[PDB]
Amino acid sequence: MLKPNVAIIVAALKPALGIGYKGKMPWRLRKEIRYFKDVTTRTTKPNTRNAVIMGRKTWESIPQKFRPLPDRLNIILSRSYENEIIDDNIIHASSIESSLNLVSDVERVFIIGGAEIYNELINNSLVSHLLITEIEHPSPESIEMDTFLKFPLESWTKQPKSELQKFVGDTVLEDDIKEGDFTYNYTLWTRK
Amino acid sequence: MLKPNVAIIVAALKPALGIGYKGKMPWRLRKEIRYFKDVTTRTTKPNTRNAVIMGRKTWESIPQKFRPLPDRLNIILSRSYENEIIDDNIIHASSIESSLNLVSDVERVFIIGGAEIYNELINNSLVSHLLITEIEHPSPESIEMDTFLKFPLESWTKQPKSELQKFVGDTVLEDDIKEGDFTYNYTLWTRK
Numbered sequence: 001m002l003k004p005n006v007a008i009i010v011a012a013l014k015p016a017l018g019i020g021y022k023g024k025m026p027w028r029l030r031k032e033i034r035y036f037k038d039v040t041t042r043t044t045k046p047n048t049r050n051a052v053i054m055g056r057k058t059w060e061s062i063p064q065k066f067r068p069l070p071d072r073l074n075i076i077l078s079r080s081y082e083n084e085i086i087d088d089n090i091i092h093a094s095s096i097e098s099s100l101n102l103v104s105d106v107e108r109v110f111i112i113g114g115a116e117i118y119n120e121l122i123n124n125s126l127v128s129h130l131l132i133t134e135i136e137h138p139s140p141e142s143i144e145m146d147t148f149l150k151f152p153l154e155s156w157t158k159q160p161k162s163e164l165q166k167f168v169g170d171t172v173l174e175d176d177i178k179e180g181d182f183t184y185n186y187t188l189w190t191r192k
Numbered sequence: 193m194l195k196p197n198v199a200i201i202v203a204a205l206k207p208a209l210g211i212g213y214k215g216k217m218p219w220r221l222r223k224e225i226r227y228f229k230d231v232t233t234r235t236t237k238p239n240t241r242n243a244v245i246m247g248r249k250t251w252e253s254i255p256q257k258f259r260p261l262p263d264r265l266n267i268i269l270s271r272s273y274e275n276e277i278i279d280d281n282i283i284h285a286s287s288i289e290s291s292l293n294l295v296s297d298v299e300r301v302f303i304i305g306g307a308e309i310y311n312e313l314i315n316n317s318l319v320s321h322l323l324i325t326e327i328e329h330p331s332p333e334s335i336e337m338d339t340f341l342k343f344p345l346e347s348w349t350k351q352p353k354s355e356l357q358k359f360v361g362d363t364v365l366e367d368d369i370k371e372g373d374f375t376y377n378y379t380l381w382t383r384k
């Protein structure tokens with residue numbers, strides 16, 4: 001049985017693993033936006049592309065002129081949708097199982113959020129990598145939030161930086177990136 | 193209809209998962225036949241129907257006067273078949289997926305046999321659910337059988353009864369149904 005190559009990509013504030021407040025991210029991290037773009041857009045060969053899968057709320061939080069996310073197939077989930085290919089760049093899917101059946105033309109698949117989607121996928125056997133941007137701040141409790149990852153990190157193994165570099169290819173991975181009061185690092189995890 | 197979830201519905205004798213002999217089921221479970229009927233017929237949406245898919249041999253095994261099965265779109269597969277709508281109830285097709293392009297009326301899709309169809313379709317990623325009637329008998333080696341399921345069950349998760357109830361909605365699910373020397377239970381399985 002052929003299966004797609006799927007990873008979760010997310011940015012979280014430690015230690016609680018907070019992901020959002022209201023319907024947005026509690027930070028604006030310049031370099032992290034760029035990493036996100038590169039990682040999700042990069043392919044091993046030209047004239048190929050990846051897909052991104054998101055929840056309706058995340059699609060909606062993207063300003064209209066900036067959607068779909070360029071250079072990648074965008075897949076949007078809503079329990080109100082009918083499976084439908086809108087154009088070459090946008091597909092509507094009515095369940096996770098269908099979403100994973102609509103990625104036949106891409107190289108890699110990235111689950112890009114939000115909370116409910118992440119929580120639904122982390123226990124799917126198809127997900128073989130977690131790409132976590134671990135964020136730190138002097139006083140995390142000062143950062144307001146209502147959305148958290150509920151991942152069983154004990155059943156995942158954080159890999160050495162070398163393994164991440166293997167996955168991201170040519171992208172530069174700086175350590176301990178500072179922006180304002182935040183410090184962060186990109187990480188890669190595999191299943192135990 | 194684009195990439196629908198499909199469910200396999202079958203009754204098998206444990207542990208070998210035997211399904212027939214000659215071209216017949218080695219038992220007559222009256223309650224099972226009624227459950228089969230309710231599950232495959234019932235819908236939630238307004239003016240929808242479910243679709244049942246079968247191999248050419250299974251079709252031919254239903255007495256001509258009792259086909260098509262009432263209240264469901266019957267889809268019959270054969271490698272010699274052109275993709276054609278016979279009438280509003282019957283479709284001919286050479287592939288599951290090609291058959292699905294000709295439907296629109298549909299809520300749920302069920303694979304109802306036969307053995308070759310079962311063993312082949314099991315490894316098609318459109319299949320998301322298995323409804324297996326697990327039958328037991330004191331002497332499973334007194335019930336001669338020639339046909340078996342070749343299901344990779346290590347890749348599947350047997351769900352709790354609460355999840356089956358939720359799938360079937362209204363249908364009454366009795367436990368440990370005894371008929372003659374047979375004892376059976378209804379089960380649901382999903383992909384890991």
Ligand SMILES: NC(=O)C1=CN([C@@H]2O[C@H](COP(=O)(O)OP(=O)(O)OC[C@H]3O[C@@H](n4cnc5c(N)ncnc54)[C@H](OP(=O)(O)O)[C@@H]3O)[C@@H](O)[C@H]2O)C=CC1
Pocket residue numbers: 009010011012018019020021022023024025054055056057058059077078079080093094095096112113114115116117118120147
């Ligand atoms: N820190 C990070 O890296 C990221 C953070 N986030 C954050 O996450 C938050 C949003 O998450 P959340 O509110 O949970 O929204 P999501 O983006 O997860 O969207 C949830 C919606 O997706 C649909 N959906 C979910 N499950 C299914 C299913 N099985 N089948 C079909 N449709 C499904 C439903 O749509 P409908 O209601 O239409 O049925 C549901 O309301 C924001 O705060 C956002 O900033 C987002 C991405 C990255």
Ligand SMILES: NC(=O)C1=CN([C@@H]2O[C@H](COP(=O)(O)OP(=O)(O)OC[C@H]3O[C@@H](n4cnc5c(N)ncnc54)[C@H](OP(=O)(O)O)[C@@H]3O)[C@@H](O)[C@H]2O)C=CC1
Pocket residue numbers: 201202203204210211212213214215216217246247248249250251269270271272285286287288304305306307308309310312339
């Ligand atoms: N226990 C249970 O719940 C059930 C048990 N059964 C049992 O199953 C047995 C019958 O199974 P079987 O004889 O194999 O018959 P099937 O109903 O599976 O028919 C096989 C035929 O289907 C067509 N076909 C097969 N594979 C495909 C494919 N991949 N794509 C398109 N068409 C295909 C072919 O038609 P062509 O040759 O024209 O190409 C082939 O000969 C019996 O003993 C019956 O009692 C059946 C249903 C339920």
